[PDB]
Design a protein around this ligand. Structure first.
Ligand SMILES: [Mg+2]
Ligand SMILES: [Mg+2]
Ligand SMILES: [Mg+2]
Ligand SMILES: [Mg+2]
Ligand SMILES: [Mn+2]
Ligand SMILES: [Mn+2]
Ligand SMILES: [Mn+2]
Ligand SMILES: [Mn+2]
Lengths: 440, 440, 440, 440
């Protein structure tokens, strides 16, 4: 699946619909980024710029002008075409093709932006700009307003009101359209297929990085060239470190392995976590921690629906975890007291769920302590985990265990749809998958 | 292979050996880098910082102080240890472990650098600093010198002489040690193995990006997690674009495919280019252009040795190319005149060779028009190419063809060693390899 | 006269009255300014900061917070008291005295501003700030908003709307109160008294700078320590240069001298220009140019009233000037055509009138081509001039003559009040004043 | 007196004589400076720029290039001429006149500096630059070096060594030439004449600022338009504040008045302090403190000579002060112990002497605790003072007294010359001068 021109158009109109009359919205592209010396990282367009343009070039600015409640138009600044530059660093849209390709009214050369932008802004009342987002953008916008302010003898005037569009735009991205969901559904399928391959490929003696390569190859072959975030393969005690990306260790028979990987497909992010035995068979100590994390996930998946919140479902997961850990002797005392003492926090120290979208940790307001009432169209992760440090004062068999199980869901009219259930998580189904592969 | 502690030590002493008495050299680490929102790219240490420390953390500064011709010592500023931070973003060396692990005399907290650095610099005559390399570094160094200048009532004084260490350090990196060469030799083997796999895997109907995934998987499985540069898979007319990285097109039976990929192994870069038929069989038009590019490579490999230069070997390649193109009717006129008219340049528009090392386009002085006399220990690429644009006024059969063949060599006492000959380039050996794979 | 506490209070309330509910206005003080090395210029408070505080310290910020339509309060950040610092660089208000002295609700240490300001702004909808006014201020405000934006996990939120208060505040300053006018009336008397002294003191052989010293001494003795702008004493051909401040030349018998000086009294600016013979007797050529400039001034003073504009009165002055210059042969042709050709502009090349107040070139909107309808309370200068360059192609006797006559007026309910008529401008009254002094 | 072209030439050659072969020295002019809105302070050229050019324009850069030990030349960047701009903001030298007027080899337009400077610097080994002196200068120089560094394919190269010229240039300014001394001698005469006038004019009932106006008028009439520093008139308890410039108080019969004023004449600074009774007659308590300060000055003036130091003469002054204060009961205990306890410091808390020159607090190295051996040609102030705070626990009659007496001297071959003895300081000679004036 993909995002059509029509959808990019609707999004711009949805934004403009909310802008005041006599205003201009300025959305800048991401700068290129050095990796070392003159070699650069693969380009990643700014998410908000991408959201409105589907245009993957740097040195580009969308300008949406609203004259009144029925009049508005779009100017794109982008790089001019250049034979030399393209024979080297590759094709560019240019100005001729831009209006038709991107559905914008006008297209001007980025090199002229300092001589043009202030003219577009002259006489307006409001300018919507994301201050401090990019330095070069602030330079451009401040430079344009200075011309207008100091140029009253040339009958210029600056908009006196600047407004952050980020709250507005991020509220928009918080609610996914059917097109967005179809794309995310596929990023789900692709990411899940990679996690299955990792489970099937893993043998003791392989390195954590070998499963990374397997996952990335799978993303790639389905047309998801880059991951959504730096992949984590934490075997053994490395699984207790939430952002472990060294992936440098030999995987040992007896250890668990926590794999956290996500693809980026048409800009949208998959994000799955699966934990499993390197030797294909859970031990009793591993099962005892795993069944608690799994029940937390399965209950959350039953509970997530419109009307509830992340805060609320989290309360149910806390209860499941404290109760489970008491029964294992990892915690001692009354369950209810232990909850009010947050006794779980040394072992489960992150949130249950985050928004998912163009960014893996997606934009949108959570509300105080994530108490926001969920509504259909919201996409989020469900990711309970338990992490018992190597030197935790608990029964020995639980020390140095890190387990997380993460799924991606979308809130629907009567509950949620699970986008990542195509990769197994029930421990017997994991063990069966892995036994199958060792045959073949 | 790898780089030992001893080697990192020697390098620092080699630098200090050249510093003046009463001086301090300041080498800063690379900053982390955003990819989108709060997710970051995989960390890539500054090459010069890596060269002297083998230390892959940000927020770290090497300070080498030379008191006189026999007295000198090293202070490392690096991040302090922090349980919380490491449970999240992963392990850190800290100050306790640093002196022993990295072979430095002292280790201080980066957070204290503003309160400490000016003390280290007080009373010196010279400070070696790479101005404009990183903004945060310039802020730190300028801030330290301002304290010293304005603090004469506290008996402080600033070094009045600042010197760029980059010329000195890059001259050092231009000459590889036996350890460096062993590492580069393996980056050669790994990169070559990937290009062979790409040749064996390619079928018509596959996308350019599918061969990218095959190459990256191969790098990964040999412990080269990231490439040295953004991989190019240019099939058909896409091969005429020198930095084509979209890799988005279906590969067609009849087209050639130019694959330019390199691994990064222990920090050092492989860089290979191979061009071949998507269907495993060169056409006559393809052979006619390929044999010219290949003869250029084979002659260059015979000629490269101590005493000659890149400029000089390039002259021989120009002659081979002009002569070849005349015989095909791509160029008309006297060969010698055509050379003095640079008639080849529309078709071969980049250099023959670049330095290779910690950076793929490696540091070191080429001399005017790359006329520098080569010496043993120099590592460089040999990469002739011919690119006939789709709309070139030449016989039709040559239009839209892009061919390059690149090998990595090291200059030795009596010639060069080819690090990448383990992947085939003779057209019959390419066709044989590909026929073999299609069986299976 | 002076400005009371009550007036400073009213001004703040007038500003707040116009702010939106749930907003904060941030007004910063001027930075100290180096003259050479470590010696600084006399401090000059930012006019807008002065306008609301009457507080002549740097490192100070007024914060006016509007909670709703009946609730609002003021926090002043200012420098803490310090015995050492004051024994050196002089007294400071501190925080204890500030609420009572300046009539503000709270007073905090400027050194704490980064730790406090974001707390004041948390949860508001609008912040009024003058962007690009001072660099240190922008750093402070951007820093405060970044904390609030990135701090949603600490239940912080930034105002999404920033608004320039300058248009609002400058509209306020455009209309002077009775207190302001009494002060300006005295700045008028003082400035006029200086121009009379200059006329009485001038002999041929004195230098232009000697009359500067006389003027400044007069300002000083009436308690106007500094001038409003750099004083101009342009004798002879130096009078053709509108901002001639070298004042370095010997004044010659036969030349005219244009003196443009203004005092600064309680922050408010006088601005007078008078031109006169260095030898106390106008020649015929001087009278012929002088009578045109004078009639322009006298007619303008009759015409200036509520209902008309500067543009309109300027049209009458153009007519007077073109007609006068035709009769002298300086211009040739029909008067009406010459006006439509702007034939006067080589000789009268600046505006007739500028707003006067806390700044000599005072704030407030002129409207296109200064067409704004005048209203009572507006203070402005009336300053026609004619400047015949030394090499102008006109009759010899007019070359190298520069004459301007400037008065300060305030628009009243039925016309204007002249604040500077206490210094003579009729040529016979100038000559009489000067003859009297020579006795002284 | 004044500074000739020849002297400016010698100074440049003296600098070049010390530069390395293959180097360029870059000396930038001062930027204009805002006072309020669009009105600016009187221009004050950077002292070091003035020192080598005698050129009082902004947007100007001296470039001294040293090719070898006998070859060197000067390029001045300065503002181009412009009719419009000069008819407004006044005359400019331009490029045509500059070589002859300023004795430089070449003169280029400042507007071209970014396109030219890097060409001048290309291929050099050293560039002398004052980093952090002015922001615009650092931008220019960093910009020029970046072009050269990144432009090796255009056979450019940057000087790898940057050196601060300030230590070198300030050592030069520390030793005044006969021309400089003649100028300083006159700045002495002028400043002294102002202090005499202040003594003769002062009556009780006058304000501190009235004597400021008298002093400035005197500076002005001798052709010293601006003071060297912000004038201090501290009567009564205001005299205990070392940098008291409010000068806002009525001068009371019975109080002392400390006047600290200095002129700026041809760029060079006078700096005199005199203290005296507002009513022309010292009381006994005033005499008792005054005679200690005066004996300190008179002994210092006998002692200052080549071979001694400021530190050393200061030791003698400490002894005089401690002994004097003991005899008055202001200090109790053994004199020698009290000295080793620095018991004087609450009452005499600044240095005895500072370098004087183009800056009042002039450049040049003092050595640790001002221990530098004095040599002929050094110009410095001699300024002992005693300041008894209003709430000091000492006999009542001494509280709230501030007395300083400052003279300017130049070290000669066999002692010093007093430049400011033309204004009286013996108390009977003060009282006589003041009685004479009252007749006016
Ligand atoms: Mg265990
Ligand atoms: Mg073809
Ligand atoms: Mg004349
Ligand atoms: Mg007393
Ligand atoms: Mn997640
Ligand atoms: Mn290459
Ligand atoms: Mn005026
Ligand atoms: Mn002094």
């Amino acid at each position: 699946s993909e995002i059509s021109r029509q959808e990019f158009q609707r999004r711009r109109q949805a934004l403009v619909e909310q802008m005041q009359p006599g205003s201009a919205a300025l959305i800048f592209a991401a700068p290129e980024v050095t990796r070392s010396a003159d070699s650069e990282y693969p380009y990643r367009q700014n998410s908000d710029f991408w959201y409105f343009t589907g245009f993957n070039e740097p040195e580009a600015v969308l300008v949406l002008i609203k004259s009144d409640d029925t009049h508005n138009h779009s100017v794109l600044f982008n790089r001019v075409r250049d034979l030399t530059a393209e024979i080297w660093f590759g094709r560019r849209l240019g100005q001729d093709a831009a209006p038709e390709k991107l559905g914008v009214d006008r297209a001007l050369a980025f090199s002229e932006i300092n001589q043009q932008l202030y003219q577009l802004l002259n006489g307006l009342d409001v300018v919507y700009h994301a201050q401090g987002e990019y330095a070069y953008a602030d330079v451009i916008v401040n430079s344009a307003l200075e011309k207008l302010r100091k140029g009253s003898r040339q009958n210029l005037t600056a908009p006196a009101t600047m407004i952050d569009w980020r709250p507005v735009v991020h509220e928009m991205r918080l609610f996914k359209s059917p097109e967005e969901i179809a794309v995310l559904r596929r990023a789900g399928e692709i990411t899940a297929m990679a996690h299955t391959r990792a489970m099937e490929k893993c043998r003791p003696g392989m390195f954590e990085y070998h499963l990374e390569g397997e996952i990335h190859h799978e993303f790639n072959r389905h047309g998801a060239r880059y991951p959504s975030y730096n992949t984590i393969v934490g075997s053994g005690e490395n699984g207790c470190i939430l952002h472990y990306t060294e992936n440098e260790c030999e995987m040992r028979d007896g250890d668990l392995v926590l794999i956290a990987a996500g693809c980026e497909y048409k800009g949208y992010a998959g994000d799955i976590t699966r934990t499993f035995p390197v030797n294909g068979k859970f031990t009793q100590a591993q099962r005892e921690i795993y069944d608690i994390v799994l029940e937390s996930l399965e209950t959350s998946l039953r509970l997530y629906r419109p009307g509830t919140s992340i805060l609320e479902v989290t309360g149910e997961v806390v209860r499941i975890m404290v109760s489970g850990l008491v029964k294992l002797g990892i915690l001692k005392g009354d369950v209810d007291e232990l909850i009010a003492q947050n006794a779980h926090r040394p072992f489960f120290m992150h949130g249950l769920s985050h928004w998912l979208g163009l960014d893996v940790h997606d934009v949108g307001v959570y509300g105080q302590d994530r108490s926001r009432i969920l509504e259909p169209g919201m996409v989020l992760t469900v990711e309970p985990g338990l992490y018992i440090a190597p030197d935790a004062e608990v029964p020995e068999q639980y020390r140095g265990i890190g387990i997380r199980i993460e799924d991606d869901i979308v809130i629907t009219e009567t509950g949620n749809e699970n986008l990542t259930a195509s990769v197994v998580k029930k421990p017997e189904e994991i063990e069966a998958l892995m036994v199958a592969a060792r045959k073949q």
